[PDB]
Amino acid sequence: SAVKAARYGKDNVRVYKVHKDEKTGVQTVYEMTVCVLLEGEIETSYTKADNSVIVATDSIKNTIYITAKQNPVTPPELFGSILGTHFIEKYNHIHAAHVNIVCHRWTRMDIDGKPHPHSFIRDSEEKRNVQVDVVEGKGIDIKSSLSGLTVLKSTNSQFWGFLRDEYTTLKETWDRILSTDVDATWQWKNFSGLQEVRSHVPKFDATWATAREVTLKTFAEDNSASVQATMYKMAEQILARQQLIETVEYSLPNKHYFEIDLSWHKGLQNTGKNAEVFAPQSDPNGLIKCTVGRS
Amino acid sequence: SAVKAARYGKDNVRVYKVHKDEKTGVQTVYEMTVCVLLEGEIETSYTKADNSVIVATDSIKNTIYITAKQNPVTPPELFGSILGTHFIEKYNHIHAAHVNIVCHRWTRMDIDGKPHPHSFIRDSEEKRNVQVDVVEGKGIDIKSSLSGLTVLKSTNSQFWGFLRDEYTTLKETWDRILSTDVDATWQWKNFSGLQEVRSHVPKFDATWATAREVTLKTFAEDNSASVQATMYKMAEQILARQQLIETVEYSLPNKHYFEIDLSWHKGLQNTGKNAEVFAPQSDPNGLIKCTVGRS
Amino acid sequence: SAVKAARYGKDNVRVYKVHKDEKTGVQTVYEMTVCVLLEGEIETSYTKADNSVIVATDSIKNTIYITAKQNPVTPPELFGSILGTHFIEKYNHIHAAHVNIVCHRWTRMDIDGKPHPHSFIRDSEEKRNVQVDVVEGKGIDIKSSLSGLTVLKSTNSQFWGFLRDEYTTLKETWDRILSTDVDATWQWKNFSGLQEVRSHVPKFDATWATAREVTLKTFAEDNSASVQATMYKMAEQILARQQLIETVEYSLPNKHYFEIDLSWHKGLQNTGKNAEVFAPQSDPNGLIKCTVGRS
Amino acid sequence: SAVKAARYGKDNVRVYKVHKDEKTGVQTVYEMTVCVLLEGEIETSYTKADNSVIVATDSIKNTIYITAKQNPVTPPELFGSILGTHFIEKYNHIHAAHVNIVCHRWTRMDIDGKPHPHSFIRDSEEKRNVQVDVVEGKGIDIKSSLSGLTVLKSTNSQFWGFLRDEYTTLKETWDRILSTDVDATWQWKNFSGLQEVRSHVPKFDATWATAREVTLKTFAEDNSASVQATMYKMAEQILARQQLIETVEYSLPNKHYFEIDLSWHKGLQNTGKNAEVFAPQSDPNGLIKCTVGRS
Numbered sequence A, B, C, D: 001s002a003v004k005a006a007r008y009g010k011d012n013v014r015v016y017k018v019h020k021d022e023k024t025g026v027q028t029v030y031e032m033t034v035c036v037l038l039e040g041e042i043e044t045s046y047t048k049a050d051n052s053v054i055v056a057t058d059s060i061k062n063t064i065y066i067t068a069k070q071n072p073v074t075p076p077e078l079f080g081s082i083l084g085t086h087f088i089e090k091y092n093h094i095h096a097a098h099v100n101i102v103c104h105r106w107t108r109m110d111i112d113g114k115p116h117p118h119s120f121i122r123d124s125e126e127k128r129n130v131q132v133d134v135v136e137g138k139g140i141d142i143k144s145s146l147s148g149l150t151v152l153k154s155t156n157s158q159f160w161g162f163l164r165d166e167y168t169t170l171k172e173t174w175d176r177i178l179s180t181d182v183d184a185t186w187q188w189k190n191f192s193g194l195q196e197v198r199s200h201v202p203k204f205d206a207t208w209a210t211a212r213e214v215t216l217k218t219f220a221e222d223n224s225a226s227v228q229a230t231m232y233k234m235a236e237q238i239l240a241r242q243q244l245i246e247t248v249e250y251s252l253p254n255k256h257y258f259e260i261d262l263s264w265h266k267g268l269q270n271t272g273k274n275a276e277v278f279a280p281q282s283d284p285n286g287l288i289k290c291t292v293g294r295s
């Protein structure tokens, strides 16, 4: 037998950083969960009990805190690139670093219509994420994403004209509820190294904001023919607005809300045009994926 | 042996209701999870396998949907009171109904600075809850609550002057992070029945809004001497603003963020006045409770 | 306003303890999650920012580890009583301690039909729990429980003869699946203090084992007329086997498995006597409770 | 823009099946959660709102139940292969099916030392899983796995001799706790189609049992030099015992248990050789992966 692939590191490293403005007294907080996995010439730790090649996972944890102390943690694309680059430059035998960051929301509170200097609220479990792969000699690959954005529209969704055969019981519909949890990922063109990532720093927050805005507006305004059709419209718009993106991937559950026939009870009408009360279904759920790139 | 207490019913009943405005085309959605447990002269179902006294839990589920079809589902205090009253009036041998409702957030989307007619976002896992106990001959007891409101302030929290003995290692501090998940419950004076609950309908949403506003403002503005002291200030304000409330209960975790000493690494300064990077602790957590009533 | 009730302490304190046998080399591990909440003359911490009355929650955490170091941690009824007694005896102004312990399973591995000296497996998320309330002048109240015991029987469960009215759609049945997660709690007679708890130490593990055995055997063997009827049989047996128990409480979800009618597809028969494939329902679920005491 | 990749289907489909033995009266239950995602000539559903190419996800759900009715559901490798093959054969334009199955434990109860005919217990959240990719013209690729196997050993784990630099604070150790949740995956050689999968049916359960046995025995008996070294020993043994496996992948968290220094309290000794009470850490955790193949 032989080691075909190996990676190891530290997962679930929670990090908080505060920035304090001297002049204004305003404080800004950032909270993330970080995972770093390393690859390189480490096979002998597995095959020969040779620990000399192991940068301890505990040391990886220390490095994450030290790096956060000495560098900006925002945008996360930059922080992840700094962190990954550190490992491949510091350790001769480490040749790839894989950095995953999940950013948690701490949104500044409005108290009496004024933004508060040091108080924050977690407005939703929506996350902003990055995956950064730093590979020696091959540059920096960054995938940025938003996840956990949960939306619902109560009308202007349709689903008809699908394949009907002996396995089909679903009725066609011209008016249904559509609800999903949005997972959207945009993959940047490969960057040659840290200097190039630094050169594009303003694009990272702007593109995240664009992706979120396009997702919300398209969902709200499309008279949706299917999840498939609406998601494609979202992806093509993001690609049009940011030339440094190579692909956009969406993964959308279809979280079903079923009509409840109440006609057995005193002829109560609660279906079709008379549907008011529905039963949200926890499972199963449709799952629709697509990756859209350039022609 | 004897049955000392018994209750049974249906839990985790998910309900969605849509309201459609004829004139304006605006739609409004409500989504809840409902539990109904009944008590009464039902001991023989346990002791004698006498099912004749059992209103099937499946029928309780049907009743919840039918009641939501025929009545407003908001405010939840009203819906819960209607639902509980139904059971004690319909069934001679049922003498108490216990209704728990959790309301999930579906907040109308703003698209281009305009509220959208039929699109919604789940902005946070904060819930609004009610517990309604309808007891034959004894009226309607309602406890209203908010839960899952997660906040953090990065300064203006202190904790010093506590008891120090041979079990104590905690350093006194004049500047720390304070973060919590707010659970706040206000208990209404007993209502004589449904007519009285109806008479106070406008107070329910207003008091919820007040409780939320007082909680956020007090948290943000108090130079906190302890969780204990800040929570008491919140409770006394709510009691002052709504005379129909008898008690307010808060239950607050203290979600700790620890300083990280980095001085072992090149004398890096990251404690006290120099603290920038902290380690959020998943566990353990302080837990502080108090119930405040009138003198 | 006035403080009507207050308690505070430390939750989610994870503790592991190992015992090493000198002679045999056998090791035994215990892992628990502990919560301790205190009550007493502490109102001024809430009302006057007087921290002098506060035993810091951090110190409570330290105390839990120190107490586990100096005392047996099994049975948990004993450990909880030692821990609660410590607080009311050490601190003049603390008058009640509330201790909740959850015990996690670490079951010794069998390797080649021989018990291994120091290797363990988590065989299920079933827990053994205790709630110990130590109240100055009023002794020690202990509630012991098992939870998270998930079982299913595929036949020998019935449900017919229930109330039928205009809200009822459920068909009577003489053969259904019954599945539940067992939560069972037995409440001990009040103990005068630690000496009395020590005197009954052997009864704690024995009664837990009895409660578990009676629950499993009764579930497996009863031709169940309802959840209500089967649960009562369990409770009456436990009360008969241990005279120091005052009440037994069961709380059982009814986790539904629905028949799937496939007759629309080529006349496929999958209902009643021909039912083979079922759809487990995540929600809603029946919830049936009862507390059984002595005549 | 262009569709680069697309797949869609139904996730979280819960399925239960019962087998009833005519002669003996013994019943056996199987419960699974199934996901099926399809690929093929479906781009126009995304780009042109052409639903004619969509096999509705609801129909996929129906197909899963029908297939479970008409076929064995065990071993899951076989069921997944039958299910995936159905889609590529039935629908001209569907060219790949991806089937993921999670099998839940229902272990027959022993009552009075005798196996019960129809009563079952969920003994742990350990799962047996399969991923089956059926690709038209390219055969059937099967990855089998176990997950959620949680183990701990209280001694006979070491970790010393690792890289030490200015980022390192970890002390070397010759005696520590090792605890992990095992995720192990074995990838079968490609099968030409369903006939070949059928020909190897007995190997599937046998190899699962072998993988589990090798994992438990190696964990218990290895005087572990690191997670890396112990996991490699497991993988090489599985590859040696089953020639039809091409690779074995392990993914292991290192779930840390920290010593607690109590020496500040009355010189209490709780470190090194005197360590009895430890603090389980919820996060962060080491994460160690490796894929082992043939030379």
Ligand SMILES: O=c1[nH]c(=O)c2nn[nH]c2[nH]1
Binding pocket: A008, A054, A055, A056, A057, A058, A059, D159, D170, D225, D226, D227, D228, D254, D286, D288
């Ligand atoms: O077994 C281990 N492997 C590692 O890579 C490591 N790093 N810190 N502790 C560790 N333990």
Ligand SMILES: O=c1[nH]c(=O)c2nn[nH]c2[nH]1
Binding pocket: B008, B054, B055, B056, B057, B058, B059, C159, C170, C225, C226, C227, C228, C254, C286, C288
């Ligand atoms: O065992 C049962 N008890 C009940 O109260 C009930 N109601 N519906 N089905 C039921 N099954």
Ligand SMILES: O=c1[nH]c(=O)c2nn[nH]c2[nH]1
Binding pocket: B159, B170, B225, B226, B227, B228, B254, B286, B288, C008, C054, C055, C056, C057, C058, C059
């Ligand atoms: O606000 C606090 N209250 C307390 O009771 C406490 N104990 N430790 N830290 C604390 N902080």
Ligand SMILES: O=c1[nH]c(=O)c2nn[nH]c2[nH]1
Binding pocket: A159, A170, A225, A226, A227, A228, A254, A286, A288, D008, D054, D055, D056, D057, D058, D059
């Ligand atoms: O939007 C949808 N896409 C689909 O593929 C599908 N299948 N059933 N319902 C559906 N809705």
Ligand code: NA
Binding pocket: A087, A088, A089, A090, A091, A092, A093, A094, A095, A136
């Ligand atoms: Na390198």
Ligand code: NA
Binding pocket: B087, B088, B089, B090, B091, B092, B093, B094, B095, B136
């Ligand atoms: Na009544």
Ligand code: NA
Binding pocket: C087, C088, C089, C090, C091, C092, C093, C094, C095, C136
């Ligand atoms: Na006392």
Ligand code: NA
Binding pocket: D087, D088, D089, D090, D091, D092, D093, D094, D095, D136
């Ligand atoms: Na095909």
